[PDB]
Amino acid sequence: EIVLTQSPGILSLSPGETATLFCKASQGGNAMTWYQKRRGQVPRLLIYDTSRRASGVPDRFVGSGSGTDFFLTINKLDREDFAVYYCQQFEFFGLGSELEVH
Amino acid sequence: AENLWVTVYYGVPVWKDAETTLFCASDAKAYETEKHNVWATHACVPTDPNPQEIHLENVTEEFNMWKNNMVEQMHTDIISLWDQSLKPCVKLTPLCVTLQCTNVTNNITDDMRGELKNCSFNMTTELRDKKQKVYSLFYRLDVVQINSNKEYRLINCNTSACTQACPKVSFEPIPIHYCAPAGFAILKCKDKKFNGTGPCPSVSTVQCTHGIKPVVSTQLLLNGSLAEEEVMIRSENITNNAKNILVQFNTPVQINCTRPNNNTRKSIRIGPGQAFYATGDIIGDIRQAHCNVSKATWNETLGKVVKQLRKHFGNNTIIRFANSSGGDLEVTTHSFNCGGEFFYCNTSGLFNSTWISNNDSITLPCRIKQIINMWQRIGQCMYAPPIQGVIRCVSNITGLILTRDGGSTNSTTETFRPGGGDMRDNWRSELYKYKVVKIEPLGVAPTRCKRRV
Amino acid sequence: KEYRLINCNTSACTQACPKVSFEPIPIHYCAPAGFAILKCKDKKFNGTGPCPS
Amino acid sequence: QVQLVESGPGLVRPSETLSLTCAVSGASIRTKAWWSWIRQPPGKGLEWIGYVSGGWDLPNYNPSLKNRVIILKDTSLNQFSLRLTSVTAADTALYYCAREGPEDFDVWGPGFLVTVSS
Amino acid sequence: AVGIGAVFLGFLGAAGSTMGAASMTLTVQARNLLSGTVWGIKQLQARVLAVERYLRDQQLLGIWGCSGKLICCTNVPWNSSWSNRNLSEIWDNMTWLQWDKEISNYTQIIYGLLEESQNQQEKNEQDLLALD
Amino acid sequence: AVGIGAVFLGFLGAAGSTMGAASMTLTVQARNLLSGTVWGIKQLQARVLAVERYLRDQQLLGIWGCSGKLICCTNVPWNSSWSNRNLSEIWDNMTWLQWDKEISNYTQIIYGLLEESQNQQEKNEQDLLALD
Amino acid sequence: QVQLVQSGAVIKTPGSSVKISCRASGYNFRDYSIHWVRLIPDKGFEWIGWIKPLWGAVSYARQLQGRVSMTRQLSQDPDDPDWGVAYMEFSGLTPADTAEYFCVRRGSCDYCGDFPWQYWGQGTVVVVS
Numbered sequence A: 001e002i003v004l005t006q007s008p009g010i011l012s013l014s015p016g017e018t019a020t021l022f023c024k025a026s027q028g029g030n031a032m033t034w035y036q037k038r039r040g041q042v043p044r045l046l047i048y049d050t051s052r053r054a055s056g057v058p059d060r061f062v063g064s065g066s067g068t069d070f071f072l073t074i075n076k077l078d079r080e081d082f083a084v085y086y087c088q089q090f091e092f093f094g095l096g097s098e099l100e101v102h
Numbered sequence B: 001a002e003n004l005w006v007t008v009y010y011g012v013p014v015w016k017d018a019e020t021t022l023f024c025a026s027d028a029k030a031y032e033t034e035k036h037n038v039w040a041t042h043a044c045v046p047t048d049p050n051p052q053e054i055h056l057e058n059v060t061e062e063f064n065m066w067k068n069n070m071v072e073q074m075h076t077d078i079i080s081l082w083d084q085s086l087k088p089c090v091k092l093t094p095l096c097v098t099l100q101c102t103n104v105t106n107n108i109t110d111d112m113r114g115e116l117k118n119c120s121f122n123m124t125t126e127l128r129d130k131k132q133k134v135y136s137l138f139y140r141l142d143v144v145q146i147n148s149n150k151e152y153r154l155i156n157c158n159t160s161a162c163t164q165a166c167p168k169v170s171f172e173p174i175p176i177h178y179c180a181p182a183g184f185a186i187l188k189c190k191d192k193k194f195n196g197t198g199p200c201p202s203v204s205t206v207q208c209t210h211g212i213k214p215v216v217s218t219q220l221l222l223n224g225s226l227a228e229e230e231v232m233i234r235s236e237n238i239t240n241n242a243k244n245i246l247v248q249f250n251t252p253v254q255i256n257c258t259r260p261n262n263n264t265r266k267s268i269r270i271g272p273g274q275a276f277y278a279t280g281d282i283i284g285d286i287r288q289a290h291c292n293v294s295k296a297t298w299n300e301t302l303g304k305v306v307k308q309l310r311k312h313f314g315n316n317t318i319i320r321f322a323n324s325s326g327g328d329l330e331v332t333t334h335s336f337n338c339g340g341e342f343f344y345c346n347t348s349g350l351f352n353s354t355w356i357s358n359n360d361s362i363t364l365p366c367r368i369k370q371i372i373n374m375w376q377r378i379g380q381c382m383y384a385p386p387i388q389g390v391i392r393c394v395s396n397i398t399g400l401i402l403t404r405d406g407g408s409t410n411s412t413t414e415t416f417r418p419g420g421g422d423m424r425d426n427w428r429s430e431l432y433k434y435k436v437v438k439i440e441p442l443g444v445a446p447t448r449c450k451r452r453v
Numbered sequence C: 001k002e003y004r005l006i007n008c009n010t011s012a013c014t015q016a017c018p019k020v021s022f023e024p025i026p027i028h029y030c031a032p033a034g035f036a037i038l039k040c041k042d043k044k045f046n047g048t049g050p051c052p053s
Numbered sequence D: 001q002v003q004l005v006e007s008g009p010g011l012v013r014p015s016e017t018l019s020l021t022c023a024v025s026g027a028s029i030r031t032k033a034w035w036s037w038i039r040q041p042p043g044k045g046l047e048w049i050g051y052v053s054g055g056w057d058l059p060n061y062n063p064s065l066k067n068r069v070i071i072l073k074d075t076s077l078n079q080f081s082l083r084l085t086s087v088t089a090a091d092t093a094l095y096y097c098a099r100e101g102p103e104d105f106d107v108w109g110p111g112f113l114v115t116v117s118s
Numbered sequence E, F: 001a002v003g004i005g006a007v008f009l010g011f012l013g014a015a016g017s018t019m020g021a022a023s024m025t026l027t028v029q030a031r032n033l034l035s036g037t038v039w040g041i042k043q044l045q046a047r048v049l050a051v052e053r054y055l056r057d058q059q060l061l062g063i064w065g066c067s068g069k070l071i072c073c074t075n076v077p078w079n080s081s082w083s084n085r086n087l088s089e090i091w092d093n094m095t096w097l098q099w100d101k102e103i104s105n106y107t108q109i110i111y112g113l114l115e116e117s118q119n120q121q122e123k124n125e126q127d128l129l130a131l132d
Numbered sequence G: 001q002v003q004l005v006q007s008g009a010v011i012k013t014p015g016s017s018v019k020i021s022c023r024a025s026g027y028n029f030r031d032y033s034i035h036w037v038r039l040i041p042d043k044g045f046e047w048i049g050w051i052k053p054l055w056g057a058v059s060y061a062r063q064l065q066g067r068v069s070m071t072r073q074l075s076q077d078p079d080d081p082d083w084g085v086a087y088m089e090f091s092g093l094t095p096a097d098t099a100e101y102f103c104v105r106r107g108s109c110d111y112c113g114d115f116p117w118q119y120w121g122q123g124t125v126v127v128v129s
């Protein structure tokens, strides 16, 4: 199996700032999927193939990372972007990084 | 000397990866049989014998069978050819009619239902005024109970019309050689150990591919090209489970398959020059169609693929097999076309095994559909004509198509299930060697020569 | 009072497929090799005669 | 109705390879036109860098640009790009993409100040 | 190998060797570029695509200095920024694939330079035959 | 206009100018002559008509003095009855359309004269290389 | 557009079964796989299984085998070949199974794999009590 770990967990930030969410895999050499899920809504894809963006994704989201270590950088934090953020490798999911308003 | 000029060299050997159309080629021995009792040796050029397999040395090309072209083109060509060999044949539109069906005359137990239902029905003759009452035999998998009395209809008669196949054209595979046209060349990776993706250090160019006989099978792909020494598994990603795993093994496993129910065909005249081929009498015992494989050779080849599959999943790993998890019929069983009639044969006898890190024969029962809907179109079904005689066939099982279950939650075991899926995974088992490149002449290069006036 | 369709004594009729729609997509016409399409870009031009631009 | 919009940096280090790219809408690139780059040092007059053509002309630049300028057209993306290798801080200038036609440089780009600073 | 000593074999055989060795065997890669009820449309579009590509290459040559000379010195110089390697090293060190990977950027400016050089040679020859 | 000074633009751009100005821009009109389930028959007959016309023109050139020189001085003289105008006037005064309207009658005799001149040059060169 | 319409929320007794229909519309249904995923509160996501509707070939998760069954209904008419219906039947319900279930389809790009699910259904709340 693949164990995924969302290291910041709760992140307490203010609007307009930047954010960096780290995820760590148990097995390197693979792609990574980043999902956004707001409160009480449908989840929504952000990043596939560890650097590419989906339709309707603003380019202020930047996925990066390699091996076992991946980053998701969100510049210019809107109020709408304060949500839960998940990582995905083929079936296994991290437990979710929750973005909190400070 | 430092006043370098440029020179154009035409006919420079250099290529690029490209995606163009291809070139059919059939052997002339299949052309010797008159009037095309197999499909399309007239729609396909005769193969020039022993063409140029000229080697290439010190050349490293990256192959990729998963994003490969020409397997899509082979799928499209076989689909269009299968369509093009049915337009001459008779449409079975007037056969959609109320069938009065009973069980076949047999000492049937109440537990095991009769697979064959006898059905009598009205049918138009050649003359429009006169209709006749005629009977036939059908399978359980072709009739449904429309709704005392018990009356049936055919299964396809509320989704599409059906085309009866012509008994002239046979579905047995003749080998297809693919050839490049002018300005293109087919690079064959001749590496012994090669997992389908990456740099192949020993390639060779060619003009025409080897004999690729188009077989139709879901699990246990038949009569393919076996490997040189080892048993090679191939996947687009082994850690991924949504992609299939193409297992190609070394020693081909002999399989015997037969329908022992002797059949008598019967010509019923639908109209003027319209022949329909129904099933008449069952001469002899009423038995069940079945396939055999050698128990020891199958256990040995499963040991070989276990020994090879432990490379990608660690040594101390339990590997077990299971049967198919479900779905439609022709992905649960393994299906093929023996002697011009279709078999759907159960595979639970081949995949109940577990494997720890330290003169008999398996028989398996089949079922025989008379109608088929292969490639799962929206509005086509092929009726197949019943053939005379007890029917048997011998084949060389070459590879499997397996699928890992979506294992999570810290399990040592990793199970495998045979899954048919798309038909392209058959042709990707025979086009992993080849790729197509476009020759680009007229390179340019600096040297010391100036064109005089 | 019994009727019939209007076409049933001159021709058979083909029902249009509800897939294919008759709304016009724009067609660009192009010349092949060895031919060129001259467009008269004159503002005031009555279709016949010399087009100066 | 033609619209030209530059894109690229406005702050680069000297002794580097500068490159802009101007997108073109409202018309086609392969017209009777020279898609050109023209610059202007701040507070000073214009300085014509060069052009490229949508036909098959070879691009001809100002010889004061010291053969460091390669304008490359991209007809599959309706663009054309300026290059400037080995820049200096005295090359700080507003840059302009424009279109020479039967009239003289009708549609320009807005023009962006590239301030070369170390 | 078999073709050692007398350095030749079939087409694309020199593709692994260096470009200096491959330069002596160019006639066959030039040769195997032209010769070789609905499938006839596929065969026909393959054949006319082959002859269209061959005619485009022969027309690209014909507007340059050489019609069918197959090795053409010409009058355009060489920017040393493009190759930026030792000259005799590339004919004993590089394959044509690696060389085409090297000058992938520096393409399509060379062809316009060739056309300008050929038209300049044509107007110079026209003037030379005019004043005589 | 835009192409003033450096007199060039796209194909058929010189068609309005005089023939002396248009003579410097001939490579592109030569270029844009070849490249560019039942409609495939229309596409294919258009493509093979294009390559048939181009091959007829290249064969008409190839039987004359020039294979692909694209400007060919030759050895046949000029009847002054045909042009009957001032020589340097037509290169600053006439379009190619007007010139083709002028010599519409005087055609197809020039081509046989060219063939006779080329065959005479060939037999003279055969004799010259024979006696040496 | 790609539309995945699920069925309404449901309250089922323990030990019983449930069937959730995912109706897909706006693309050729015989091409792309359909995956089923769950969202349990305070447990994150958990993948269930995929089904390829061209032959209905299914694969289930290891810790859910024997309890789930996925079928499909294709469109057999030459006029509307796009719509289709997946069905997920979940049997043997426990109080831990109270969750929100989703049917998903992957993207349609080149480098898009199979698991980067682009299009999502609206979700279906299943409560066991």
Ligand SMILES: *[C@@H]1O[C@H](CO)[C@@H](O[C@@H]2O[C@H](CO)[C@@H](O[C@@H]3O[C@H](CO[C@H]4O[C@H](CO)[C@@H](O)[C@H](O)[C@@H]4O)[C@@H](O)[C@H](O[C@H]4O[C@H](CO)[C@@H](O)[C@H](O)[C@@H]4O)[C@@H]3O)[C@H](O)[C@H]2NC(C)=O)[C@H](O)[C@H]1NC(C)=O
Pocket: B111, B346, B347, B348, B349
């Ligand atoms: C591919 O091939 C495999 C291998 O054979 C098939 O698997 C078998 O499938 C059958 C049914 O599909 C399984 O079920 C068995 O049916 C027998 C007959 O049923 C009668 O008797 C039962 C009472 O036992 C009645 O309820 C019923 O109405 C019938 O009257 C049963 O006898 C079997 O019971 C077995 O287990 C019990 C356990 O207590 C024993 O006591 C019995 O003696 C007996 O051994 C059973 O119910 C059968 O189990 C499968 N085989 C194996 C080895 O597991 C696949 O079906 C086939 N694929 C397809 C698509 O058909």
Ligand SMILES: *[C@@H]1O[C@H](CO)[C@@H](O[C@@H]2O[C@H](CO)[C@@H](O[C@@H]3O[C@H](CO)[C@@H](O)[C@H](O)[C@@H]3O)[C@H](O)[C@H]2NC(C)=O)[C@H](O)[C@H]1NC(C)=O
Pocket: B099, B100, B120, B121, B122, B133
């Ligand atoms: C083949 O065609 C014949 C001719 O139409 C069919 O026979 C007819 O079937 C109908 C339907 O059952 C019969 O009507 C019923 O008959 C019964 C018995 O006589 C009567 O009790 C009912 O009230 C009703 O009238 C009809 O009689 C029968 N005609 C004949 C001559 O048999 C037949 O069903 C078709 N199919 C087969 C398989 O033969």
Ligand SMILES: *[C@@H]1O[C@H](CO)[C@@H](O[C@@H]2O[C@H](CO)[C@@H](O[C@@H]3O[C@H](CO)[C@@H](O)[C@H](O)[C@@H]3O)[C@H](O)[C@H]2NC(C)=O)[C@H](O)[C@H]1NC(C)=O
Pocket: B323, B324, B325, B326, B332, B333, B346, B348
């Ligand atoms: C793969 O193998 C398993 C066994 O390891 C098969 O499971 C068996 O499936 C059959 C039917 O699919 C079950 O038969 C039952 O028979 C009764 C008798 O009337 C019927 O009422 C039931 O509805 C059902 O049909 C059988 O119980 C079951 N085996 C066990 C142990 O539960 C499975 O079908 C195989 N899959 C394929 C595709 O062959």
Ligand SMILES: *[C@@H]1O[C@H](CO)[C@@H](O[C@@H]2O[C@H](CO)[C@@H](O[C@@H]3O[C@H](CO)[C@@H](O)[C@H](O)[C@@H]3O)[C@H](O)[C@H]2NC(C)=O)[C@H](O)[C@H]1NC(C)=O
Pocket: B348, B349, B352, B353
């Ligand atoms: C799974 O693989 C093996 C083939 O090697 C087969 O397992 C067999 O299952 C039957 C079930 O009735 C066993 O029959 C009875 O088993 C009891 C023990 O539970 C035994 O005491 C009886 O005397 C009787 O044999 C049979 O022994 C067992 N085979 C072995 C070698 O243990 C089975 O065919 C495969 N499953 C499927 C679905 O095909």
Ligand SMILES: *[C@@H]1O[C@H](CO)[C@@H](O[C@@H]2O[C@H](CO)[C@@H](O)[C@H](O)[C@H]2NC(C)=O)[C@H](O)[C@H]1NC(C)=O
Pocket: B254, B255, B256, B292, B293, B294, B361, B394
């Ligand atoms: C499949 O059928 C073939 C029929 O030819 C079997 O081959 C024969 O097997 C017998 C028994 O060992 C031999 O005596 C013959 O020499 C074999 N003939 C040939 C031509 O091979 C084969 O054994 C069967 N295989 C299985 C697994 O049942």
Ligand SMILES: *[C@@H]1O[C@H](CO)[C@@H](O)[C@H](O)[C@H]1NC(C)=O
Pocket: B299, B300, B353
């Ligand atoms: C395969 O053969 C080995 C060697 O006899 C044996 O130990 C093993 O149990 C066999 N496998 C099966 C499934 O019978």
Ligand SMILES: *[C@@H]1O[C@H](CO)[C@@H](O)[C@H](O)[C@H]1NC(C)=O
Pocket: E101, E102, E105
């Ligand atoms: C070719 O140009 C690209 C920029 O488009 C550059 O990244 C690459 O390094 C260049 N190739 C070489 C060999 O320098």
Ligand SMILES: *[C@@H]1O[C@H](CO)[C@@H](O)[C@H](O)[C@H]1NC(C)=O
Pocket: F101, F102, F105
């Ligand atoms: C060409 O010949 C025709 C007779 O066929 C004659 O009428 C015409 O005047 C000639 N053209 C010129 C320019 O003299």
